[PDB]
Amino acid sequence: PVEFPKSLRASSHSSEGGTTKEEDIYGYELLYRSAFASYIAPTGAWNLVWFQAADGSIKQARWYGEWVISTVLAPGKALQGTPLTALLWGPQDTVALYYLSPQFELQEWCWDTKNGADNKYDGALNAAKVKVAPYSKLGAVSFGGANLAVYYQGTNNKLEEYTFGGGQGWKKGATLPGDPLPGTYISFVNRNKWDANPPSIAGYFQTVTGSLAEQVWETGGWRIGQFVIPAAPFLTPISATVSPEKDFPKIHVYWLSVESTIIESVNWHGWKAPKQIDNISVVKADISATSFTRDDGTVDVRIYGTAQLNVLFERIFRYGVWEEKIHSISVGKEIPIEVVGVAAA
Amino acid sequence: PVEFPKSLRASSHSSEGGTTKEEDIYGYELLYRSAFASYIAPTGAWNLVWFQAADGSIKQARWYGEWVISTVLAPGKALQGTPLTALLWGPQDTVALYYLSPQFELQEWCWDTKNGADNKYDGALNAAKVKVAPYSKLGAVSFGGANLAVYYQGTNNKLEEYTFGGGQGWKKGATLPGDPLPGTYISFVNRNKWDANPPSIAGYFQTVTGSLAEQVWETGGWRIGQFVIPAAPFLTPISATVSPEKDFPKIHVYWLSVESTIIESVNWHGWKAPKQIDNISVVKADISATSFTRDDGTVDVRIYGTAQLNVLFERIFRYGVWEEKIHSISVGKEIPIEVVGVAA
């Protein structure tokens, strides 16, 4: 069997007090510690998840009644272990998938999805040849009205912005304030794309002291936000998603504890205390959260990432509760492996 | 600060019962969870360590009185996160460093090191364009003064061999027995390297059940050896090294516990019980062990790998003791970070 810390739970069928003896799955055609990007329809009618297969290609899991796997980028397009971030924008409902080339340059893959047309093409960002820090993660937002911004880590480890729109094409944007941890995970969100207010953007990252910090863009520029987590695990995964709950924006920020359990912090008329959504240890690797508002004004959440041993999990927050059954989405060949909980010497 | 499990020790200066409050180093120009290959001179006079930088280049740490860092392969040559394995062989003390291309093909970098000559070139193995499983690790041994063998995982997840020598060039070798874990770490060693033909070769790997197993080559074929660890962490790093102690081969096999502490099992007139060499948690990532025999017939060991938070450590087994101070070898810019032990 494989050994696992007996005080940790490896899956939803682990014993209440920790792992004793169980069976878990190794999906070995999923890149170990793959990056993930995700987008659920505003109605919740379909899901999109992107990940990296073991052979380096970028693949897509699409849910519409059931999950269907396809390949969007052939091997050689993306860095082995590339970060991934995605958005949907524009007149033709264009999916934009951002990744890194093997030469650590920003890349963009586009897919218009309006009226069932499958037009897929490289975005203009590729031509800008933006070199980033080799360990840079990626975030991205649209501000509506053909404006985009990609967020990344520059070679001096500052968070950097690249903007698109206003008839300009892609241009270097601001250098964001703060002191980001080299290789920090990042996640940027549009705080209120639903209302008719001025745009408000927020980003979340880890600083050189290990704390979690927040970028806020309002009324003309970036400044350090009020969200502060004094201590977090080294290079913890970070993912944020926003949807309106009861007609007010609800920010969800997710990262991992020292047990590699997912911690949630919610902002809805103020920040709530961080709380663990479940006590199951995931693989310490990229997670991706997405959300939508139901007709009754409550916000569903989906979180994707890597669960033991190496499977793509889906965590479901639906009607105010995290559901106890955690699905896995098969992306290739799998083997089951016996797992035993083992204590310290 | 960054949070760390308080029941684990992150460094040699951690509290005896675990991490409380301490400062540790982040070397962010070392690829996070870099692969490592290593070689100490048979006399112990100098050391060679290879690793991958954050920018994807393959770099070299050379110790001769002090550590000196250089670049041996430019960015773009190696897969990001490539495995690494090395040997020294031949009349001209040639280093052969094996790695994967960005297209998951076996690659070889060569460096003659006899009489202070700096002759460096791509090896002929590159021309064979051997496609491997994308998560394959690498091992390699030389026997008989002019034979090489490279070990890797094929796309069907069997352990495979590619051979060089006998005036043949690089040829497909044996397919090894057993059911290797996909992406298993591997480490192959020559049991008695003084041109003993036929050779005796041993390899160590993790099976599809999570157990650790042993590959054995003797006249007549590869076979599954007697070394068995029934349970090990998923995709645990594995490294082996052999040197003669008191005129008999001493096999050292290293892997990680669930706490990411290094476990040692020695074969010297039979296998000894596995034992933890120290209780400091390393980063769960590739480790590389190398060894040499001293004048008094005892075997020194050096282990290289990633320590908290991201530094290249050197563990030293010298004159029968693992030394308490664990060095780190700086490979680029670093930042200090406060670390606090946390329970839940």
UniProtKB/TrEMBL annotation, chain B:
Residues 9-18 have a biased composition (Polar residues). Belongs to the fungal fucose-specific lectin family. It comes from the Eukaryota. InterPro entries: Fungal_lectin. SUPFAM superfamilies: Fucose-specific lectin (SSF89372). Residues 1-20 are annotated as: Disordered. This is Uncharacterized protein. Pfam families: Fungal_lectin.
